[PDB]
Structure 1
Amino acid sequence: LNEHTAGDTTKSPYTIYAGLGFAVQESCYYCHGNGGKGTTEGLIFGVPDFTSTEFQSSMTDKQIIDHINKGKGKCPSYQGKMSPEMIEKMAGVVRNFAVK
């Protein structure tokens, strides 16, 4: 994956994950907050634990990119809602919750 380098927050995937330009219920952090572990609402909906080695080993990098594009269940589809370059940065954010 193409590494996101720290920079201006208007270009950052964290600003998108934290809900810039999205309804709260369509923002990653609303379901995948508490550090990727899942919020109260996210756990009700069935989110996996992004900090978990076992979750991370269940997906390839390509599968994470394809997932963010397609959505699944209560996880929304984001194709056309952010650029392909941002989706790839976002896949890196998902990975980085388990990078210690």
Structure 2
Amino acid sequence: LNEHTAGDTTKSPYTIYAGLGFAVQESCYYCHGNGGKGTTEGLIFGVPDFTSTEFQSSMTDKQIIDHINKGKGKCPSYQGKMSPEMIEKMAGVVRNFAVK
């Protein structure tokens, strides 16, 4: 993955994760907040723990990208809602909850 390095917040995956341009219920932080561990609402829906090395070892980089495009169940599909380059940055954000 081409990891996102710090830059203008209007071009940042974190701004998208925090819900820019999205309804609250379609914003990652709403379900995957609390530092990637899951919010109350996300846990009701069964979100995984992005900070867990166990979860991270359950997906390849490509599978994270494919997931963000396609969605699964209550995790929405985001293909056509952000660019492919942004989805790849977002996959790096998912990875980065589990490392220092």
Secondary structure of the 1:29 match is helix
Structure 2: 5+ residue stretches without partners: none
TM-score by length of 2: 0.99
1:3 Cα shift?
Answer: 1.3
Secondary structure of the 1:73 match is coil
Residues 10-43 of structure 1 deviation map (CA, whole Å, 9 limit, x = unaligned): 0000000000000000000000000000000000
Give the structure 1 partner of residue 92 of structure 2.
92
The size of the alignment, in residue pairs, is: 100
How many Å separate the matches in 1 of 2:38 and 2:32? 4
TM-score by length of 1: 0.99
**Cα RMSD for the two superposed structures:** 0.3
How many Å separate the matches in 2 of 1:99 and 1:22? 27
How many Å separate the matches in 2 of 1:29 and 1:40? 11
Secondary structure of the 2:15 match is helix
Identity of aligned residues (%): 100
The runs of 4+ residues in structure 1 deviating greater than 4 Å are: none
Secondary structure of the 1:16 match is helix
Residues 42-96 of structure 1 deviation map (CA, whole Å, 9 limit, x = unaligned): 0000000000000000000000000000000000000000000000000000000
Secondary structure of the 1:64 match is helix
